[PDB]
Every structure is written in C-alpha cells, then in structure tokens.
Amino acid sequence: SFAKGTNVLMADGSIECIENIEVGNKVMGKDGRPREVIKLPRGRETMYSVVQKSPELLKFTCNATNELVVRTPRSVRRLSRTIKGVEYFEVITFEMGQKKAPDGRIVELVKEVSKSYPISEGPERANELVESYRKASNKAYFEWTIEARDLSLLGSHVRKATYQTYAPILYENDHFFDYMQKSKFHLTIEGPKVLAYLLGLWIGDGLSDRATFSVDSRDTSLMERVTEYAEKLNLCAEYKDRKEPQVAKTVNLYSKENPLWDAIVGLGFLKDGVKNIPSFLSTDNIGTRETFLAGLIDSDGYVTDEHGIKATIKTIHTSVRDGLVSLARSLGLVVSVNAEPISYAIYMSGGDVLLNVLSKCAGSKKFRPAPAAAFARECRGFYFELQELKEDDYYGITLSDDSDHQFLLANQVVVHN
Amino acid sequence: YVGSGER
C-alpha cells in the first residue's frame, strides 16, 4: 500500500492518484494490458520511503508490509580455501533460503550460501554442485518479493546486489497520429515519423517564434534528412548556405500558420514561453517516441561508444529535461541526469533499445545500424535506499486474483499490489 | 490486515 498522493499509471495512459482511484478501474500492467481494481486497502502503520540510490531519481513511499518487487543476480563460484590444515573446495552461491525475523515469522528470501569439502575428496562434487546451479533456471536472476521492513534482514552482499525494477511502457496511444488528421487528406504514411523528427529537431537547436532552427552546416546528411523531411510534410527548407560564414547555419522552414508551428503548439512542444516536452508523448505510439527522440539527438545530442553505446543530450529548460527523462524511460532506455555550468545532461543507454532509436537519426556521427535481430524491452533495474518513517495513513489498490498483482506506478516503477 | 493486497 502507498502513501497519499502516490501518482499512479492508469491502463489508458493517464496519471490518477492511489487515493482517487476507484474500484472497477484499470491500472497499467507491466505488460501493456490493464489490471482490474477491486479493493481499496486503507489503514495506518510505519511507512517506508523507497528512493533510488545514487536528481531525476525513481522514488515511492509505501507501507512497511509492502512487498517490494525486486531482482537478485544468480551467482556461483567454486574457489579453494583451507580451513586450518584442511584445504576445501568451497562453492559459494546465491539461493532461495530462509531466515526468521524478530516478529516471529520465517521469511522466504535470498541468501549467500557456502558449501566446502576437503580437497582429497575430489572436486568431482564441488563441480556437480556448480553445474546443477548453472542449468536449473532459464534466467540469470531471481524475480521475487520482500516486504519493505524485511529488507534489513538481507545480508550485506545479497542486499547491495538486489534491486527494484521499472518497466517500459509497451502501451501505445496515438494522440499524435490524430493531431495530424485535421489539416490534410494527402499526407504520407510517413506523416508521424517526419513530423516527430522535425519536432525533435526543433527541441535541440530550435528557435521560439518561427519554425526556424539554427542547424549545423557541417553535417551533409542531416542537411539532406532535414530537407527531404521538410518536403515530406509539405515545406521547402530554404535557408542560408554558400553565404553566411560560421558553422551554425540558421534554417527556415516555410509552407512553399505553417503546420510545423501549428504542431509545435497544438501538441504543445512550447508550453508557455519556454520550450517543453509534452507528457502525452510518453505513452504515445513508440516509433514516434523513438523518432522524435532521434531528432532531438541529431539536433544537439552526441553519441559515444566507449563502454557501450550511449547518447547524451543537453537542455537548460528543466521543463524539457524532466520531459525527456520520461519519454526516454517510456521506451526502455536506462537514464541519468547531470547538471553542468544552468545546463542539464541526459545520459541514455540500453543496447538494442537505444539502437532502434539511433538508426533513425541521420547526423554523420549519430547514426548507428538498427538491431541485428528482434529485441524485447526488458524491465530495467535500479538499486535503492530505504528509510524508516514515522506513521501515517495509506491506501492500497488490491488487484484481482487471476492477475499478476503488479501494476506500474506513475514513474514506471513496478510495485506489487 | 493487508498491504495493497491482503492474505
């Protein structure tokens, strides 16, 4: 059960409160489809504040009896230690085991186990152990649940190795495929794509009062992309070039008012004065999510590949940062923000999920071929901090009995009913 | 008695 005001995620895409949710309601299941609300667990107790351990942190406050959904890596190593005179073939593993708490109960949780045998007995077994562990599960981790207060029962190693997980938003709206079906009756099946990329393109190095946006001259692929896309909607991308010495070539997009600036406002990529990331986009049709994203990177982001692919973007307007930090997660990317010299930074990563988003970019050093096969948008983990808190009211949302019992908080975090 | 679900 969760504290008053715990923003939630409805199966339609909307964000109601845990308190305001009524019975017969649908909440967002960690798989796209909905979950039916039936009860409305009320009461009081100690409340625990879960907070991502590391300022765009994933946090949520719950009831001390709340089953946090978590994961813990499997693990097995066969070393060789000597117990004062006798050398054993120790086998350490992470496995399901019990430990009693001070309440009374026997809690079912994960523990680090050790099983040592003297050498001479031949590691023939020390091995068979390691091999049984190794082919017992089809995943490389344990999906399990422990109540908020029982986290302290975890022994060091296992605890730091345990994390909660937020889920991508596999759910797709279309407020975007629509906003367009109100001006044309002859606009390409590429409608959404092209408009998302330009829209993205507008958030990076854009300008607010005209569909004009200071683009780079040095990028002779971005140029084509920009142009070829400018016409895709219905606009020639006149500009400067071969007249106007500098690298940041201002570009103007006309209707050869203009449906571009009509989009920047209708859908609100310019909420009152300063630019802005609309939150409806988070739960909108994926490709538009990735495509819009592509634009923004192509605009003022940069891609580095040192310890894996990862793209950084910059913004000043938090009204955008916060916007991106969620449009990002909505897809499955892993994200973090760092504040520099007024200036914000959004680091994104995720392998294929990020590729799907970068194979749509066009800027010289930002493209990247699309995935090599099919790829799923797995839930992403996040280690955290749990702080014991006074007492207060709380409100659960008990789901059915033939369902998973998990639903998504507003911040994509996967909590248990 | 519960916990956002009850057994």
Side-chain angles (χ1 to χ4, degrees):
Chain A
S1 298
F2 332 86
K4 177 191 179 187
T6 282
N7 320 296
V8 186
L9 211 74
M10 312 311 314
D12 78 307
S14 54
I15 298 186
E16 248 89 89
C17 277
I18 187 75
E19 60 252 67
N20 310 176
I21 302 181
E22 304 151 47
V23 179
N25 263 163
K26 313 299 190 68
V27 283
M28 185 67 68
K30 67 186 183 52
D31 82 321
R33 303 150 168 64
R35 303 303 174 210
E36 274 230 7
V37 176
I38 70 195
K39 287 182 178 61
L40 290 184
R42 297 282 185 300
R44 288 171 52 94
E45 186 159 46
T46 274
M47 294 296 280
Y48 284 103
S49 78
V50 180
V51 43
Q52 175 167 41
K53 187 195 299 183
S54 62
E56 306 289 334
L57 315 168
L58 310 180
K59 76 181 69 179
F60 76 79
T61 356
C62 64
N63 45 332
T65 152
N66 206 193
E67 310 211 322
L68 300 156
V69 179
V70 294
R71 303 203 179 181
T72 306
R74 287 172 74 67
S75 180
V76 50
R77 63 169 302 199
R78 202 216 64 195
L79 59 88
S80 312
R81 172 203 303 206
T82 310
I83 301 297
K84 346 138 65 187
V86 183
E87 307 168 340
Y88 298 72
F89 270 138
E90 175 169 36
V91 180
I92 314 184
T93 56
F94 267 29
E95 43 187 284
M96 278 303 199
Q98 303 157 332
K99 165 167 176 61
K100 128 185 185 309
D103 101 290
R105 321 155 299 172
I106 306 299
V107 156
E108 164 170 288
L109 48 49
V110 170
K111 309 144 73 172
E112 187 176 72
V113 169
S114 174
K115 296 171 173 160
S116 15
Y117 327 138
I119 294 285
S120 31
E121 304 196 304
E124 283 216 43
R125 183 165 44 150
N127 296 341
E128 288 180 66
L129 167 51
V130 189
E131 263 286 285
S132 316
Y133 182 76
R134 285 184 174 166
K135 78 197 168 200
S137 147
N138 64 299
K139 338 83 90 168
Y141 61 97
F142 296 112
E143 198 180 357
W144 63 304
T145 56
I146 231 179
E147 305 191 1
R149 57 183 152 149
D150 301 349
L151 193 53
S152 45
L153 299 184
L154 286 187
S156 41
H157 285 183
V158 174
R159 166 63 164 96
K160 298 189 179 292
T162 294
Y163 52 96
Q164 270 180 299
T165 72
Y166 68 101
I169 298 174
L170 296 205
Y171 184 58
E172 287 170 309
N173 291 319
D174 258 304
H175 185 143
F176 208 84
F177 175 86
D178 297 322
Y179 184 87
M180 285 186 85
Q181 294 213 323
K182 292 171 57 63
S183 173
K184 323 295 175 309
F185 212 89
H186 40 27
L187 219 319
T188 9
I189 172 51
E190 310 188 1
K193 167 173 56 186
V194 186
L195 175 43
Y197 182 70
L198 293 200
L199 267 180
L201 256 175
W202 187 65
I203 332 301
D205 26 44
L207 299 171
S208 22
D209 60 44
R210 61 195 111 161
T212 305
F213 54 94
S214 166
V215 169
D216 181 286
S217 55
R218 225 159 57 186
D219 223 331
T220 91
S221 38
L222 191 42
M223 291 312 83
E224 313 215 319
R225 173 53 81 74
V226 168
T227 263
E228 166 229 27
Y229 266 35
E231 170 234 43
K232 282 289 172 53
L233 288 189
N234 170 61
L235 315 70
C236 212
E238 186 259 5
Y239 52 25
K240 274 60 189 179
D241 201 70
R242 279 97 217 81
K243 54 147 42 280
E244 178 194 51
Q246 230 254 46
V247 44
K249 277 177 189 167
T250 296
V251 179
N252 297 275
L253 285 56
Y254 302 130
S255 210
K256 220 95 73 60
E257 55 169 301
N258 66 321
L260 184 63
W261 188 269
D262 262 340
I264 299 187
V265 182
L267 305 164
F269 290 77
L270 177 51
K271 185 193 59 59
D272 306 311
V274 295
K275 298 176 186 168
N276 159 77
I277 277 286
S279 69
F280 84 91
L281 194 52
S282 292
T283 61
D284 211 325
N285 162 287
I286 274 164
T288 306
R289 264 183 301 192
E290 320 185 310
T291 285
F292 163 79
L293 251 187
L296 170 46
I297 284 164
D298 255 323
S299 59
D300 74 334
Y302 62 95
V303 188
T304 60
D305 28 45
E306 285 209 306
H307 295 274
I309 190 66
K310 80 156 59 172
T312 316
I313 296 177
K314 299 288 267 297
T315 195
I316 299 81
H317 325 304
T318 53
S319 47
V320 194
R321 160 190 56 156
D322 304 330
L324 148 63
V325 182
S326 195
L327 166 69
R329 294 201 176 99
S330 58
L331 284 167
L333 305 175
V334 176
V335 194
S336 81
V337 182
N338 216 184
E340 295 190 70
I342 290 192
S343 166
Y344 286 72
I346 292 59
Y347 301 94
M348 314 178 273
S349 59
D352 292 333
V353 167
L354 183 56
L355 287 182
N356 229 52
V357 169
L358 293 176
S359 54
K360 300 173 161 63
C361 281
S364 191
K365 316 317 192 301
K366 318 227 179 70
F367 175 72
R368 283 294 179 310
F375 75 98
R377 304 176 169 276
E378 291 184 50
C379 302
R380 292 306 211 201
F382 76 105
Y383 302 98
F384 57 96
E385 285 298 290
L386 202 82
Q387 176 52 27
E388 169 136 50
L389 273 193
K390 50 190 288 294
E391 188 163 88
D392 166 63
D393 4 306
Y394 66 73
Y395 335 63
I397 261 58
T398 308
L399 303 186
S400 86
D401 208 51
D402 65 288
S403 81
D404 89 320
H405 305 292
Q406 300 182 62
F407 68 86
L408 302 189
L409 286 190
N411 55 20
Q412 283 212 283
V413 170
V414 170
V415 288
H416 182 292
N417 86 133
Chain B
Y1 208 56
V2 70
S4 227
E6 48 183 68
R7 295 174 190 182

XYZ file of all heavy atoms in Angstrom, chain A residues 1-2 63 66 396 398 417, chain B:
105
model
N 0.828 -1.230 0.000
C 0.000 0.000 0.000
C 0.852 1.265 0.000
O 1.928 1.319 0.605
C -0.952 -0.027 1.187
O -1.815 -1.135 1.061
N 0.346 2.298 -0.667
C 1.111 3.524 -0.809
C 0.517 4.805 -0.273
O -0.697 5.000 -0.305
C 1.461 3.694 -2.286
C 1.551 2.388 -3.011
C 0.402 1.797 -3.543
C 2.765 1.711 -3.098
C 0.456 0.552 -4.151
C 2.835 0.464 -3.699
C 1.677 -0.121 -4.228
N 3.818 1.151 2.579
C 3.527 0.549 3.875
C 4.603 -0.496 4.189
O 5.018 -1.267 3.318
C 2.115 -0.080 3.846
C 1.844 -0.913 2.564
O 2.420 -0.655 1.493
N 0.946 -1.897 2.675
N 4.528 -3.708 2.623
C 4.507 -3.713 1.161
C 5.537 -4.685 0.572
O 6.697 -4.702 0.980
C 4.805 -2.299 0.661
C 4.212 -2.014 -0.705
O 4.573 -1.029 -1.319
N 3.293 -2.858 -1.173
N -3.918 1.071 -0.373
C -3.536 0.047 -1.320
C -4.573 0.005 -2.418
O -5.586 0.680 -2.340
N -5.399 -3.307 -4.027
C -5.564 -4.746 -4.299
C -6.181 -5.083 -5.662
O -7.294 -4.654 -5.964
C -6.440 -5.438 -3.252
O -5.957 -5.150 -1.934
C -6.412 -6.933 -3.484
N 0.882 -5.348 -5.770
C -0.404 -4.968 -5.161
C -0.446 -5.341 -3.676
O 0.212 -4.713 -2.842
C -1.602 -5.600 -5.929
C -1.960 -7.016 -5.462
O -3.134 -7.334 -5.242
N -0.957 -7.852 -5.280
N -3.385 -7.008 8.254
C -4.713 -6.991 7.621
C -4.694 -6.824 6.088
O -5.687 -7.209 5.422
C -5.597 -5.876 8.227
C -7.100 -6.183 8.152
C -7.616 -7.364 8.714
C -7.994 -5.326 7.475
C -8.966 -7.696 8.598
C -9.368 -5.655 7.357
C -9.834 -6.849 7.917
O -11.144 -7.243 7.747
N -3.589 -6.257 5.550
C -3.383 -6.013 4.095
C -1.959 -5.502 3.804
O -1.044 -5.781 4.572
C -4.418 -4.959 3.531
C -4.098 -3.527 4.087
C -4.434 -5.009 1.977
N -1.791 -4.766 2.701
C -0.500 -4.216 2.329
C -0.499 -3.766 0.883
O 0.560 -3.638 0.280
N -1.700 -3.515 0.356
C -2.002 -3.105 -1.035
C -2.490 -4.345 -1.785
O -2.637 -4.360 -3.013
C -0.794 -2.528 -1.743
O -1.187 -1.332 -2.389
N -2.735 -5.371 -0.967
C -3.215 -6.690 -1.345
C -3.285 -7.319 0.043
O -2.584 -6.840 0.943
N -4.098 -8.359 0.250
C -4.218 -8.977 1.595
C -4.360 -10.527 1.620
O -5.197 -11.093 0.879
C -5.402 -8.322 2.347
C -6.733 -8.222 1.534
C -7.872 -7.498 2.296
O -7.777 -6.259 2.535
O -8.865 -8.181 2.655
N -3.557 -11.196 2.467
C -3.586 -12.668 2.570
C -4.186 -13.137 3.883
O -3.618 -14.025 4.538
C -2.172 -13.295 2.455
C -1.453 -13.112 1.095
C 0.026 -13.631 1.082
N 0.762 -13.231 -0.144
C 2.029 -13.559 -0.443
N 2.769 -14.312 0.382
N 2.572 -13.127 -1.578
